[PDB]
Amino acid sequence: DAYHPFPWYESMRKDAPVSFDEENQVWSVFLYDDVKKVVGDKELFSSCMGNSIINMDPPKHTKIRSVVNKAFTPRVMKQWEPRIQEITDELIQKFQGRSEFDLVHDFSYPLPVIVISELLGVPSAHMEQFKAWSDLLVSTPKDKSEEAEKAFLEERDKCEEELAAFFAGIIEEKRNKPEQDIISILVEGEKLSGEELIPFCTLLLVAGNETTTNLISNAMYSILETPGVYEELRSHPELMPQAVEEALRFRAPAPVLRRIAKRDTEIGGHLIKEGDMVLAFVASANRDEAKFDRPHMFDIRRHPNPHIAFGHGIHFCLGAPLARLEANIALTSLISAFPHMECVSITPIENSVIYGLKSFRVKM
């Protein structure tokens, strides 16, 4: 099913590592070296596809990225660890007494949304409206592709335009009364306009909510499926940062990244024409035998672990430290609260560009 793409990746790495789809006119790249080159080579492969920095090339990207780095420094993450912990503990309290529960609905789905709202300075008396927007951001164009996509895109514009106005309001607020949130930090050289700041805030939801949820779900799944690891982590919570890196390698939430060739060039010995679209499967790269010893094994001690779950190069995930922090806290906290846990059932997300779970039911 959609939760089990790895055999197919393995077949492509072996049989068709650089492949052209004649219907969609797109290349797919599956080997670690090829994927990493495509993703990192800003000179040869463009990210230009209101999407903010993730779809900008230099020099525009350079200018904005350098300004927003200030919002994710180790100092800021340290500052927020307390609050992420409190949020995590509060979520857990709601299902602490149950013999069965859905890890997604009850825990991994709400957690990143609550965290980012507080990090974006969303006033607490406006939390539901914000959550509602975040839900709309990950709604499917369903169903399906029957030219009703025109509608979906309209409801997406609607949602985004409502987010824009909302962020506009918070931005003005933080100008008058700054606090310790990302918006305060970016409105305090290095001075973005609202036309750049607003699309950036929306990107944080788009780039960070569902991926972080899916990281947490996928990490717990990998942990449960691997004998002894749950108990080892419970006894030795200091192993968690490394376990998180292995979960990123093993079950990356964002399996595929797009680029456009800026010039005719070769990838893995295949000529990619200027203007051609390329899909770089970081999920496949992360399983590539040529780069990782025994890639099929989920080894929480794997070190070094040069996965590309967060990308590579100029667009390397801005939220990496926050995702790492959220996952460490979420996972350590979950495993501490529960002596034993077993997988009952999963329902996979059915979406090419996404790897994760719609539901993850576990029992004590």
In the set 35, 183, 186, 203, which binds ligand HEM (CB under 6 A)?
203
- In DSSP terms, 28 is beta-bridged to 19, 279
Using the contact rule CB under 6 A, the part of the chain among 30-38, 133-141, 206-214, 343-351 near ligand HEM is 206-214
Show the site string, 248-287: x = touches ligand HEM by CB under 6 A, - = not.
----xxx--x------------------------------
Q: 353 or 364: whose CB is closer to ligand HEM? A: 353
- In the complex with ligand HEM, the residue whose CB is nearer, 48 or 344, is 48
How many CB atoms neighbour CB 157 within 10 A? 11
Q: Are the C-beta atoms of 280 and 38 separated by less than 8 Å? A: yes
Question: Is residue 159 annotated as involved in ligand binding?
Answer: no
Q: 76, 69 in Cβ contact below 8 A?
A: no
What order of strands is seen across the sheet that includes strand 342-348?
Answer: 100-102, 357-363, 342-348
Measured CA to CA, the distance from residue 159 to residue 8 in angstroms comes to 36
Site string for ligand HEM, 101-130 (x = CB under 6 A): ---------------x--------------
Q: Could you tell me which stretch among 88-96, 123-131, 199-207, 295-303 binds ligand HEM (CB under 6 A)? A: 199-207
Q: Got the DSSP string for 311-362? A: --STTS-TTHHHHHHHHHHHHHHHHHH-S--EEEEEEE---TT--SEEEEEE
- List of residues 6+ apart from 35 with CB closer than 8 A: 29, 280, 281, 282, 284, 285, 308
Q: Residue 259 Cβ, how far from ligand HEM at the closest point, in Å?
A: 8
Considering the rule CB under 6 A, would residue 243 count as an interface residue with ligand HEM? no
Within 13 Å and on the Cβ side, how many CA atoms surround 306? Answer: 11
Dihedrals φ, ψ of 296, to 5°? Answer: -70, -15
Residues 159-198 close enough to bind ligand HEM by CB under 6 A: none
Regarding 208 and contact with ligand HEM (CB under 6 A), the answer is yes
Please tell me whether residue 240 binds ligand HEM under the rule CB under 6 A: no
Among 39, 91, 170, 220, binds ligand HEM (CB under 6 A): 39
Min dist CB 257 to ligand HEM, Å, is 4
Measured in whole angstroms, the distance separating CA 241 from the mean position of its chain's CA atoms is: 17
* Residues that constitute the known binding site: 317
Residues of this chain that interact with ligand HEM (CB under 6 A) are 39, 47, 53-54, 65, 116, 203-204, 207-208, 211-212, 215, 252-254, 257, 309-311, 315, 317-319, 322-323
